[PDB]
Amino acid sequence: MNSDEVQLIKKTWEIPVATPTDSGAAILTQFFNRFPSNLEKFPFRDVPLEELSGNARFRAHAGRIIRVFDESIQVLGQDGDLEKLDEIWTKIAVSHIPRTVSKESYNQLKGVILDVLTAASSLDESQAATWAKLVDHVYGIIFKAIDDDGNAK
Numbered sequence: 001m002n003s004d005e006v007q008l009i010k011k012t013w014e015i016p017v018a019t020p021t022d023s024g025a026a027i028l029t030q031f032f033n034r035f036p037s038n039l040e041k042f043p044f045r046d047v048p049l050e051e052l053s054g055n056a057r058f059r060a061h062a063g064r065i066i067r068v069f070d071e072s073i074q075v076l077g078q079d080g081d082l083e084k085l086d087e088i089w090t091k092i093a094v095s096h097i098p099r100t101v102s103k104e105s106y107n108q109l110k111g112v113i114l115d116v117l118t119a120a121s122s123l124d125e126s127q128a129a130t131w132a133k134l135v136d137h138v139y140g141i142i143f144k145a146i147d148d149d150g151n152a153k
């Protein structure tokens with residue numbers, strides 16, 4: 001993406017990153033409510049959906065997923081940002097391989113993340129398309145590490 005696109009992503013990210021736990025909670029809540037198969041991968045799998053948003057593990061995990069995005073967005077536009085993104089997102093792919101996270105499951109979360117960010121930052125259609133470019137980019141990095149079922153390629 002170009003400099004203007006990088007600008008727009010940094011600027012609009014300011015809103016959801018202001019509240020990392022809440023933003024990550026929105027992502028996770030919507031993910032699990034729409035695609036609960038994925039909840040079985042997590043150690044809090046047995047916590048009822050009604051109690052999940054108050055669970056300490058869920059809340060801390062919310063921050064963890066936002067931190068990855070924040071680190072990624074900070075490096076955007078830096079010299080060697082492509083290589084730095086490759087490192088960040090290959091590390092994500094490798095840590096999820098033992099969890100057998102399928103491409104289908106990654107793509108389920110992809111749509112949720114874009115929906116949550118579109119809402120949070122009141123993105124219009126052109127701004128949302130810019131975000132989709134970034135997310136498609138980092139997904140390409142994940143997907144080159146894995147087969148369709150989430151095993152090492």
Ligand code: HEM
Nearest residue numbers: 038041042043057061064065068092095099101105106109
């Ligand atoms: C954008 C995609 C994703 C991001 C950035 C992401 C990020 C993270 C991070 C930062 C962690 C904690 C550190 C680590 O283990 O490396 C983690 C843990 C985890 N992720 Fe993901 N993840 C993604 C997608 C997924 C998907 C699609 C699933 C499918 C269920 C998943 C399942 C898990 C599991 C089960 C854990 C362990 C959670 C815990 O022990 O509390 N992740 N993820």
Ligand SMILES: [C-]#N
Nearest residue numbers: 028061062065
């Ligand atoms: C992973 N959340």
Ligand SMILES: [Cl-]
Nearest residue numbers: 019020021022
């Ligand atoms: Cl927060």
Ligand SMILES: [Cl-]
Nearest residue numbers: 034035036037
């Ligand atoms: Cl499901």
Ligand SMILES: [Mg+2]
Nearest residue numbers: 011012014015
């Ligand atoms: Mg501002």
